[PDB]
């Protein structure tokens, strides 16, 4: 039952439990090989995991499709390390070596357990009869296709070579297909669950977004007299919740200039919130000081570019405040949520302002254009459009900040408890839309 | 999973008017597709019309002018109004939820197909 899972969990891969519960629930899903199953899970979090226990339980062949060497690479040398009869084929690799696989394949008792596969293989008429004999002698536990967002062009990483990935699906019939990604918006889902012919019904695992100790808020810059004591008056107020600790934490601000932070570093400095600033115009020397000084809380605000990033992970940012709107949704999503990694409540801030909507919108289309130049048309194009539009939307819309995002990413009306402006104050936050129609010319 | 209820479905006068409602419920997220099928006695099931999320809306010939499908994406329901019922649209109306996004709090959902038990639609001359 449950049992043999746990002790192939320790046994093999060595762990005491899973890391999520969410995990857990994927990997037995897998497990009863009932349903094709969809795996979105952040990097991290373990997916791997989700479909190589179970390839070891199955009593036959997982195959696993993955887009390029370097992933593949990664996982056989640990899987190895483990003792576990894994083989990859690509065509980084040798004729003859090549030869000797696709033969052990064809045997009546294969040694391969778990075989990695490219795309371009996978679909290849020189791998279909090997596929055809482990189909015809039942030997085939599990298709699973890593990166499955890779089949979709409203995704940021669209491979043609996956859109064969569903004809081959149909071929494995019996056999259940795991689709796993990081990232899927519901257009990408439904493009995953279209093109790779998953069969109905579909089991689905999906972290969630949702934050409940972030406080997301919106202010309009263009209704703001003094928008430099708006921000002081925000920063203290999100340090210093522990009079005991007496100014406690500390904080980021994101600006799309290099001007604009070391000028904000200076309003804020001047106005007694202690602030510097980052971007890769400093000098080395410079920027190893300011993230020091920041990381060893001697100054509590860092005012960054996107420079600033998920390389220094800090648990107590009891704030981040755009200055400047996001290039997109993901952007904002992933910055922000540099916040509150502790658990302790902290406060997320977006400055909207329609002269920065439409620098920002231009930048893209400018860049987007320099594209179309150089490499023609493309969907991704367009998404990439789209998801600048999202967060428009965000800023310009009323309702809960953090259903807004939810709706997004494709996840449930998380449980907000009045943890938004919005759901606080839903009267405010009319006002402030209303008040910015009439300042609209 | 998800439940759906079709109603509004009873014997009618030639040229009455009918309105089927059926309301999909569960912790949908979406639905791709919501569509109306009918099945007459001892014949196969056919299309009458379906509506897509976005509102691409799709009609049998012999329906085309007579009924209107409609949806309200928010509350998960989808309305067929018939007008000028013939003897001929004498059938079972069964309503299908086609992708069917389905999702917890926690991250666990499922991407499936529902239908309705049917409704039936009987038009005397």
């Known amino acids: 039952p449950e049992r043999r899972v746990r002790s192939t969990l320790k046994k093999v891969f060595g762990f005491d439990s899973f890391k999520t519960p969410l995990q857990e629930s994927a990997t037995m899903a897998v497990v009863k090989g009932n349903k094709d199953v969809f795996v979105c899970m952040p990097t991290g979090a373990g997916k791997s995991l989700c479909y190589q226990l179970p390839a070891l339980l199955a009593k036959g062949i997982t195959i696993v499709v993955s887009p390029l060497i370097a992933l593949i690479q990664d996982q056989v040398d640990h899987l190895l390390t483990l003792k576990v009869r894994v083989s990859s084929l690509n065509s980084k690799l040798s004729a003859q070596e090549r030869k000797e696989l696709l033969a052990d394949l064809e045997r009546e008792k294969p040694q391969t357990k778990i075989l990695y596969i490219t795309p371009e293989m996978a679909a290849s008429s020189s791998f279909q009869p090997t596929l055809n004999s482990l189909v015809s002698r039942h030997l085939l536990s599990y298709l699973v296709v890593d990166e499955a967002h890779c089949v979709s062009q409203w995704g940021h990483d669209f491979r043609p070579d996956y859109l064969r990935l569903g004809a081959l699906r149909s071929r494995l019939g019996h056999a259940p297909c795991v689709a796993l990604t990081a990232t899927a918006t519901p257009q990408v889902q439904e493009d995953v669950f279209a093109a790779l012919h998953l069969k109905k019904p579909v089991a689905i695992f999906k972290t969630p977004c949702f934050r409940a100790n972030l406080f997301y808020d919106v202010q309009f810059k263009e209704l703001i007299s003094d928008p430099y004591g708006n921000l002081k008056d925000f920063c203290l107020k999100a340090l210093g919740q522990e009079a005991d600790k007496g100014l406690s934490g500390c904080g980021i601000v994101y600006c799309r200039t290099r001007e604009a932070c070391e000028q904000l570093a200076i309003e804020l400095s001047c106005r007694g919130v202690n602030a510097k600033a980052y971007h890769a115009g400093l000098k080395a020397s410079e920027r190893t000081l300011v993230q020091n000084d920041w990381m060893e809380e001697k100054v509590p605000v860092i005012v960054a570019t996107i420079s600033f990033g998920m390389g220094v992970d800090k648990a107590n940012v009891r704030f981040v405040a755009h200055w400047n709107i996001a290039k997109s949704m993901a952007g904002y999503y992933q910055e922000s949520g540099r916040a509150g990694r502790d658990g302790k409540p902290s406060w997320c801030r977006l400055y909207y302002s329609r002269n920065d909507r439409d620098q920002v919108s231009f930048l893209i289309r400018k860049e987007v254009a320099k594209l179309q130049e150089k490499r023609g048309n493309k969907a991704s194009d367009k998404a990439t459009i789209m998801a600048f539009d999202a967060l428009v939307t965000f800023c310009e819309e009323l309702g809960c900040r953090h259903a807004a995002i939810a709706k997004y990413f494709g996840d449930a009306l998380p449980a907000c408890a009045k943890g938004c402006d919005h759901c606080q104050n839903p009267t405010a936050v009319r006002r402030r839309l209303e008040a910015l129609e009439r300042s609209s010319s | 999973q998800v439940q759906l209820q079709e109603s509004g479905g009873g014997l009618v006068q030639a040229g009455g008017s009918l309105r089927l409602s059926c309301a999909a419920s569960g912790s949908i997220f979406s639905i791709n597709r919501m569509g109306w099928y009918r099945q007459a006695p001892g014949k196969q099931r056919e299309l009458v019309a379906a509506i897509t999320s976005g509102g691409s809306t799709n009609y049998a010939y012999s329906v085309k002018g007579r009924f209107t499908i409609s949806r309200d994406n928010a509350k998960n329901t989808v309305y067929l109004q018939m007008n000028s019922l013939k003897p001929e649209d004498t059938a079972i109306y069964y309503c299908?939820?086609?992708?069917?996004?389905?999702?917890?709090?926690?991250?666990?959902?499922?991407?499936?197909?529902?239908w309705g038990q049917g409704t039936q639609v009987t038009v005397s001359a």
């Open positions: 299908e939820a086609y992708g069917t996004y389905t999702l917890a709090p926690t991250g666990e959902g499922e991407y499936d197909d529902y």
